Design an enzyme around this catalytic site. Structure first.
Site, PDB file in Angstrom:
ATOM      1  N   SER A  77       0.573   1.348  -0.965  1.00 33.90           N
ATOM      2  CA  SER A  77       1.222   2.248  -1.849  1.00 33.90           C
ATOM      3  C   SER A  77       0.348   2.447  -3.078  1.00 33.90           C
ATOM      4  O   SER A  77      -0.014   1.534  -3.701  1.00 33.90           O
ATOM      5  CB  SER A  77       2.470   1.687  -2.012  1.00 33.90           C
ATOM      6  OG  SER A  77       3.308   1.452  -0.962  1.00 33.90           O
ATOM      7  N   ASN A  78       0.728   3.525  -4.086  1.00 38.02           N
ATOM      8  CA  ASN A  78       0.156   3.872  -5.290  1.00 38.02           C
ATOM      9  C   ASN A  78       0.933   4.032  -6.132  1.00 38.02           C
ATOM     10  O   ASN A  78       2.453   4.583  -6.040  1.00 38.02           O
ATOM     11  CB  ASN A  78      -0.817   5.057  -5.236  1.00 38.02           C
ATOM     12  CG  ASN A  78      -1.822   5.202  -3.988  1.00 38.02           C
ATOM     13  OD1 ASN A  78      -2.487   4.212  -3.792  1.00 38.02           O
ATOM     14  ND2 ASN A  78      -1.755   6.129  -3.320  1.00 38.02           N
ATOM     15  N   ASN A  82      -1.880  -2.072  -4.706  1.00 39.95           N
ATOM     16  CA  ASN A  82      -1.766  -3.076  -3.772  1.00 39.95           C
ATOM     17  C   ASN A  82      -2.691  -4.120  -3.977  1.00 39.95           C
ATOM     18  O   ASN A  82      -2.715  -5.300  -3.459  1.00 39.95           O
ATOM     19  CB  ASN A  82      -1.694  -2.631  -2.253  1.00 39.95           C
ATOM     20  CG  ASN A  82      -0.612  -1.748  -1.931  1.00 39.95           C
ATOM     21  OD1 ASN A  82      -1.014  -0.725  -1.444  1.00 39.95           O
ATOM     22  ND2 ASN A  82       0.569  -2.050  -2.271  1.00 39.95           N
ATOM     23  N   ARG A 104      -8.620   2.518  -2.722  1.00 38.95           N
ATOM     24  CA  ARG A 104      -7.531   3.522  -3.197  1.00 38.95           C
ATOM     25  C   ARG A 104      -7.608   3.212  -4.827  1.00 38.95           C
ATOM     26  O   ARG A 104      -7.644   4.477  -5.516  1.00 38.95           O
ATOM     27  CB  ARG A 104      -6.261   3.324  -2.630  1.00 38.95           C
ATOM     28  CG  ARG A 104      -6.014   4.046  -1.462  1.00 38.95           C
ATOM     29  CD  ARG A 104      -4.584   3.810  -0.802  1.00 38.95           C
ATOM     30  NE  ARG A 104      -4.687   2.566  -0.382  1.00 38.95           N
ATOM     31  CZ  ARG A 104      -3.567   1.674  -0.777  1.00 38.95           C
ATOM     32  NH1 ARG A 104      -2.679   2.035  -1.831  1.00 38.95           N
ATOM     33  NH2 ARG A 104      -3.472   0.463  -0.397  1.00 38.95           N
ATOM     34  N   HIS A 106       3.681   3.547   0.552  1.00 37.08           N
ATOM     35  CA  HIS A 106       3.288   3.946   1.621  1.00 37.08           C
ATOM     36  C   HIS A 106       4.021   2.852   2.540  1.00 37.08           C
ATOM     37  O   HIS A 106       3.816   1.647   2.516  1.00 37.08           O
ATOM     38  CB  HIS A 106       1.754   3.649   1.916  1.00 37.08           C
ATOM     39  CG  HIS A 106       0.715   4.376   0.842  1.00 37.08           C
ATOM     40  ND1 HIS A 106      -0.389   3.754   0.140  1.00 37.08           N
ATOM     41  CD2 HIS A 106       1.057   5.680   0.534  1.00 37.08           C
ATOM     42  CE1 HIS A 106      -0.930   4.805  -0.567  1.00 37.08           C
ATOM     43  NE2 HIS A 106      -0.096   5.971  -0.355  1.00 37.08           N
TER      44      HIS A 106
END
Ligand SMILES: CCCCCCCCCCCC(=O)O
Ligand SMILES: CCCCCCCCCCCC(=O)O
Lengths: 164, 546
Positions: B1-2, B269, B297, B23
């Site tokens: 996840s962001n 993450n 990411r 996510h």
């Protein structure tokens, strides 16, 4: 009783729940969620109650992709009555009320459901829920970063035999 | 996840802004659901939540927006037990033999005949928790066994914690409320408020050991592999007690990473370390946060966030919808050099052409180059010392980079990996004219909807995970609830979507409506004010009581 909610839905079926208290607020949430996702919640509650093998046999899996029997053993161990009771006893009145409302609202939708948005109508596992079922789901999520990741490992743990 | 929170020093309007891009699964017990909750006068919050929870998990209110990302902190510890040499069902603590407790559970199983039979199973427990076995790694033999202590088993505060977050006014209030209760189980929290504060908190439930106990209490060989494993034969390796912690044995809030800034904070993450590189977070317990290389990411996000130029909502949205495969930036230039160097190789022709023509994206119209790049990277990840520039802790944002093609042993292995990746792609049933959206889909009834995005491990900010099913890649998880919040004068402006739609039920009008929109990457207003709600021509209302 003392349960009342006003629900508005905007585009895409997003619910906007208004109520005067937590019981009413949960009532609206449980009802709106059931309209969209009754079957999903019913299945996940079966999982969290350790009843997958009872309804579906040993060959199936949960939505977490665990075998039904090991999953059941894990959740029966996790969600023992004493664990659920202590968890409930530790909850504030506001949270208890949220959960009571939710169960009541979900169940209201179930009483009324005619299949319009519910594909699992008539399945024995689609049934009225209790606050304990919401505790079972909560505790299942609580341990995802912990012992839940080791569900198969816990089930596999047995002392050695006579081996060399 | 962001997650990205922007503050007054970097936002285009001088106020707060938040991108939430969790996510998470597209089905099951963690399937996000949108809702807006109001008790007039004291609660007004909107976002999305996991099934069964009567609170908002990720959302916004009048002055505040917040989100979460799975953190790198440990939320349990394994304990290696020294077994009693005379009895493998007993274990030693300070040299004294203790019996394991046996808890039996009974399960009903529906058999082939349709009848129920009862299965009884024994769960062995130590003072730390239940025993766990990973065959070939964490065994239960005559010498040792492993028990697992989960810190969140005693966290009865989790629901109160989110309900409290739901009631938070601004970033400072949010921080007070989270640090006070310590009910967050296994996520970071990031937030922005109207006044332009950006907050990162690594504030969750984390086993606590005083610093001086770690060298002797850790299992060296297991901690090296990232497992939180402690010596279970020494009572001094019990989690430490600190009166300031909300729960016995957990890390006090003052000892967990927090970054409060006015420019930006981000997390994808990785650990707390490079939340904002201008202010690294360091000197925490290994159970809490370590200075490990960041994933692609975060590296992508930082390459876009750092600097002096203002960030607008559009900037944050396009970091998602660009579908840029950021891992290509480190690898593809040198890979294309290798391709040009091997124009005689017919085993490489199709692969090299596809990679040369590729837009470096995971868009619907992205070419088969993405597929070739994926299968190459899976093999590249297994090669030893193939990076031209290896990870450099003094250049943690710009390394690793490039292929060490000047080393003959690397050039050979890299070419072989490309040859092997090409063979795999061509062995599959994909025509070379097919594009990414022809392959990656979400099934809805008997139809399929093309889904943009790609695996987070390839540095696609819009992370999507898929599995082969039939003749397609079926989406299983990734971008889920999207929320982009800003704070103009009239009230919070929230924009986004629920990628897989509100309802998991094929009968619902809301089974695939937002999924069609996700496919076309057309985000929508999330209406919050009574004015916005009343403006919606699809508005429906029902009042219920019993
Ligand atoms: C099915 C793939 C979708 C991605 C889901 C990953 C989130 C799992 C949450 C578990 C919490 C944890 O990892 O500690
Ligand atoms: C009872 C436990 C409730 C946990 C709620 C978690 C909500 C955030 C999940 C998404 C995190 C992520 O995408 O990394």
């Amino acid at each position: 009783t003392g349960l009342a909610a006003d629900i508005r839905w905007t585009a895409y079926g997003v619910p906007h729940i208004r109520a005067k208290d937590e019981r009413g607020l949960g009532y609206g949430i449980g009802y709106a969620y059931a309209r969209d996702n009754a079957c999903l919640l019913a299945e996940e509650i079966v999982t969290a109650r350790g009843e997958r093998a009872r309804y579906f046999g040993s060959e199936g899996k949960s939505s977490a992709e665990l075998d039904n029997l090991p999953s059941d053993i894990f959740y029966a161990w996790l969600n023992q009555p004493e664990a659920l009771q202590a968890f409930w006893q530790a909850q504030t009145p506001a949270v208890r009320q949220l959960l009571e409302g939710y169960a009541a609202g979900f169940n209201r939708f179930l009483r009324e459901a005619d299949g319009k948005t519910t594909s699992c109508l008539g399945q024995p596992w689609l049934r009225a829920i209790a606050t304990d079922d919401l505790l079972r789901l909560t505790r299942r999520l609580l341990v995802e970063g912990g012992v839940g990741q080791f569900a198969d490992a816990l089930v596999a743990a047995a002392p050695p035999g006579a081996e060399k | 996840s962001n997650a990205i929170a922007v503050g007054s020093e970097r936002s285009a309007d001088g106020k707060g802004m938040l991108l939430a891009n969790p996510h998470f699964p597209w089905n099951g017990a963690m399937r996000f659901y949108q809702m807006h909750l109001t008790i007039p006068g004291r609660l007004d919050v909107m976002g999305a939540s996991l099934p069964g929870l009567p609170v908002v998990n990720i959302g916004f209110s009048r002055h505040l927006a917040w989100t979460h990302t799975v953190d790198t902190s440990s939320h349990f510890t394994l304990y290696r037990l020294a077994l009693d040499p005379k009895d493998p069902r007993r274990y030693l603590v300070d040299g004294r033999s203790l019996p394991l407790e046996e808890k039996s559970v009974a399960i009903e199983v529906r058999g082939a005949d349709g009848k129920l039979s009862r299965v009884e199973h024994k769960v062995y427990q130590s003072i730390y928790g239940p025993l766990v076995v990973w065959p070939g790694k964490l065994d239960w033999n005559r010498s040792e066994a492993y028990a697992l202590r989960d810190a969140n088993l005693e966290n009865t505060r989790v629901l109160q914690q989110w309900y409290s977050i739901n009631q938070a006014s601004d970033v400072a209030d949010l921080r007070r409320r989270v640090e006070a209760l310590q009910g967050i189980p296994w996520v970071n929290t990031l937030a922005a408020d109207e006044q332009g504060n950006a907050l990162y908190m690594n504030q969750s439930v984390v086993p606590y050991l005083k610093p001086e106990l770690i060298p002797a209490c850790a299992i060296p060989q297991l901690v090296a592999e990232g497992l939180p494993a402690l010596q279970g034969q020494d009572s001094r390796c019990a989690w430490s007690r600190d009166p300031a912690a909300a729960q016995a044995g957990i890390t006090p809030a003052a000892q967990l990473p927090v970054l409060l800034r006015r420019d930006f904070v981000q997390n994808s993450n990785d650990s707390a370390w490079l939340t904002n590189p201008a202010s690294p977070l360091q000197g925490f317990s290994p159970l809490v946060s370590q200075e490990k290389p960041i994933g692609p990411r975060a590296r992508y996000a930082l390459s876009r966030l750092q600097g002096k130029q203002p960030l607008e909502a559009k900037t944050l949205e396009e970091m998602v919808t660009a579908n840029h495969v950021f891992s290509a930036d480190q690898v593809l230039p040198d890979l294309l050099r290798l391709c040009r160097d091997n124009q005689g190789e017919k085993s490489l022709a199709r692969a090299c052409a596809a990679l040369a023509q590729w837009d470096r994206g995971a868009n619907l119209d992205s070419g088969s180059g993405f597929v070739y790049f994926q299968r190459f990277m899976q093999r590249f990840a297994e090669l030893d010392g193939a990076w031209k520039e290896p990870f450099d802790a003094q250049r943690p944002l710009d390394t690793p980079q490039g292929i060490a093609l000047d080393r003959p042993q690397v050039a050979t292995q890299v070419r072989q990996a490309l040859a092997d990746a090409a063979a795999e792609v061509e062995k599959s049933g994909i025509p070379d004219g097919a594009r990414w959206g022809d392959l990656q889909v979400s099934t809805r009834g008997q139809e399929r909807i093309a889904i943009p995005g790609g695996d987070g491990h390839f540095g696609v900010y819009n992370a999507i995970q898929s599995v082969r099913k039939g003749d397609h890649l079926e989406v299983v998880g990734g971008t889920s609830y999207i929320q982009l919040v800003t704070f103009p004068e009239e009230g919070p402006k929230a924009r986004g979507l629920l990628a897989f739609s509100q309802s998991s039920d094929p009968r619902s009008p809301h089974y695939r409506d937002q999924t069609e929109l996700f496919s076309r990457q057309q985000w929508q207003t999330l209406p919050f004010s009574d004015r916005q709600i009343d403006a919606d021509p699809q508005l429906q209302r029902l009042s219920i009581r019993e």
